[PDB]
């Protein structure tokens, strides 16, 4: 599914993302926009290291979910990577929450540093009623 901006905003709020490990909702919105364009079925193969990023938050198979074909991988979220390609993001959110629990936090995603860090991210949630 491709979420509309305000629709995702309200969904992440309800799921408890606003201020999770000090991350504002506008930040999570900035991340999903640059990672998948708010698309839950997005997948990106990294030819470079043989891993794949899955879902709205583009969660990598090397550390967070199991896809079986990623060499030397771990499955920190305890999920089949397949679980992150459904229209529901309850699983994506529980895993993203796990990712940010490591020291790196949201910096774990380079796009966040390139596209969201130290920027006015309010645009992502303006007028959504969150």
Which of 4, 35, 49, 120 is labelled catalytic? 35
Which of 4, 49, 53, 67 is labelled catalytic? 53
- Please indicate whether residue 91 is annotated as part of the active site: no
Query: What Å resolution does this PDB entry report?
Result: 1.8
For residues 98 and 53, what is the distance between their CA atoms, to the nearest angstrom? Answer: 15
Tokens of 110: 């380079």
Tokens of 15: 């799921």
Residue whose pair of structure tokens reads 């079986």 in the numeric block? 68
Q: The domain containing residue 70 runs over which residues?
A: 1-130
CATH number at residue 112: 1.10.530.10
Nearest residue to 118 via CA among 45, 30, 46:
30
- Please indicate whether residue 102 is annotated as part of the active site: no
Q: Structurally, how many domains does the chain consist of?
A: 1
Tokens of 18: 């606003």
Residues ≥6 apart with Cβ < 8 Å to 15: 89, 90, 93
């Amino acid at each position: 599914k491709v979420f509309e901006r305000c629709e995702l905003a309200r969904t992440l709020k309800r799921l408890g993302m606003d201020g999770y490990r000090g991350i504002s909702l506008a930040n999570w919105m900035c991340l999903a926009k640059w990672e998948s364009g708010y698309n839950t079925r997005a997948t990106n193969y990294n030819a470079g290291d043989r891993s794949t990023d899955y879902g709205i938050f583009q969660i990598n198979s090397r550390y967070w979910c199991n896809d079986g074909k990623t060499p030397g991988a771990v499955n920190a979220c305890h999920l089949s990577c397949s679980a992150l390609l459904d229209d529901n993001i309850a699983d994506d959110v529980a895993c993203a929450k796990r990712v940010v629990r490591d020291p790196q936090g949201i910096r774990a995603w380079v796009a966040w540093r390139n596209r969201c860090q130290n920027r006015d991210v309010r645009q992502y949630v303006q007028g959504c009623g969150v």
